[PDB]
Design a protein that fits this description.
The structure is a homodimer. Chain A is about 20% helix and about 35% strand. Chain A has about 210 residues and is of the alpha+beta class. Chain A has one domain: Nucleoside Triphosphate Pyrophosphohydrolase. The longest helix of chain A has 13 residues, at about 115-125. The PDB classes it as hydrolase.
Chain lengths: ~210, ~210
């Protein structure tokens, strides 16, 4: 359903609420330089372990920027000199479907990072969390080359008693990855995923799974 | 490397590194659009100098990290720039606010080169270590951006000795194995997820088989 993508076309983007390209001009040890980047929000990510199912909770969705990069890789020149053309040839929508950690932007003032992660775990994963349930795994710079944003990773264990039914949050597929093949899943090069997934899986297996 | 002066922020229109695009597509039969930046793929490489029992990392000023740190502390610093040229950030932050610790890394922007060759070029240019492409082992491939970019990053690993190190801006960091995990766990040390993962991966997957 969410992997069904047709009529894909690419065009130049002028104004956008989501793209804030900027250039920093600066003198570094006397020499004048410039650097191109984008203003973006900080973010949080949360890894959930469902102990009732012995499974890590991830999310699957279509990422248009991933899709377009995959189309370019397979058909070079697809995204060339665009500055509204139909992608011919194109790829199935599954080429842009990623596996990710539950994640969201820090763009609501008055909310702690924990509260942001709880809202995203509800809205994306259908899991009811309390902010005090969350343990900070790591904080780091994401996208140091083009974005200056901090990202904070949380972890929490959940049970099926915290899982919402089908429907509920008024398109994302919730993924439950069994611990059996979790490492093999992260190591699988044919599955488009993020470093947060790869790190989250190996961190959980080496830091949490032994103590269960 | 850390002496950063006259910092000012202006609009970015062209840029070889960020190209604004919109994907138009029908998903649930419904017409949608998505704005993103076309960017380069990248490679990173984690080096383990077995002569020194140290991981090799790089320290450098990252202007985007700096600007984000100046937006924090001086909110509105990165507001929309008008037509009177760049807006001076006076006062700003010391350059150290933008200094990161990272894996050796670089852009995939030279046609004809394999990913391994890009990694070797960077390990020489940034770390002063001579590598052959056959020395590199693929650790992980992943999407480093998914939301506003769709860039792929490939992480390599190799063991080196001092025999591959050249003799006597970027700082080469040699992180002893003894304190590596505590270094990676330290939130006061501005580092990337690549460093956190690379340290954790090395200590769990490579280190136990040494000695
Ligand atoms: C000599 N040398 C050449 C490249 C010049 N250069 N590099 C970048 C840039 C862009 C993206 C990028 O992404 C990565 C790559 C690897 C790992 C993580 C992120 C890194 C650097 C750039 C920029 N954004 N704006 C202006 N000039 C920029 C600087 C001067
Ligand atoms: C209903 N809903 C509203 C937002 C709409 N929307 N979201 C994005 C967008 C931008 C950045 C972004 O960053 C993240 C966030 C979390 C984790 C990783 C990366 C995520 C989404 C967007 C876009 N770039 N262009 C056009 N429309 C876009 C879609 C439809
Ligand atoms: Mg460099």
């Amino acid at each position: 359903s969410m992997e069904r993508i047709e009529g894909a076309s690419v065009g130049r983007c002028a104004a956008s609420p989501y793209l804030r390209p900027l250039t920093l001009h600066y003198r570094q040890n006397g020499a004048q330089k410039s650097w191109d980047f984008m203003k973006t929000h900080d973010s949080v990510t949360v890894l959930l372990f469902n102990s009732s199912r012995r499974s890590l909770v991830l999310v699957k969705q279509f990422r248009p920027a991933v899709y377009a990069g995959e189309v370019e890789r397979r058909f070079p020149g697809s995204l060339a000199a665009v500055d509204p053309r139909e992608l011919q040839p194109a790829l199935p929508g599954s080429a842009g479907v990623t596996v990710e950690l539950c994640a969201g932007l820090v763009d609501q003032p008055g909310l702690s990072l924990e509260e942001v992660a709880c809202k995203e775990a509800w809205e994306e994963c259908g899991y009811h969390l309390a902010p005090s349930d969350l343990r900070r795994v790591a904080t780091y710079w994401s996208g140091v080359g083009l974005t200056g944003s901090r990202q904070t990773m949380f972890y929490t264990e959940v049970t099926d008693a915290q899982r919402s039914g089908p429907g509920g949050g008024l398109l994302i597929e919730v993924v439950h990855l069994p611990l059996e093949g979790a490492q093999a899943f992260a190591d699988d090069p044919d599955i488009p995923k993020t470093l947060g997934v790869i790190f989250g899986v190996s961190w959980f297996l080496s830091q949490v799974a032994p103590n269960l």
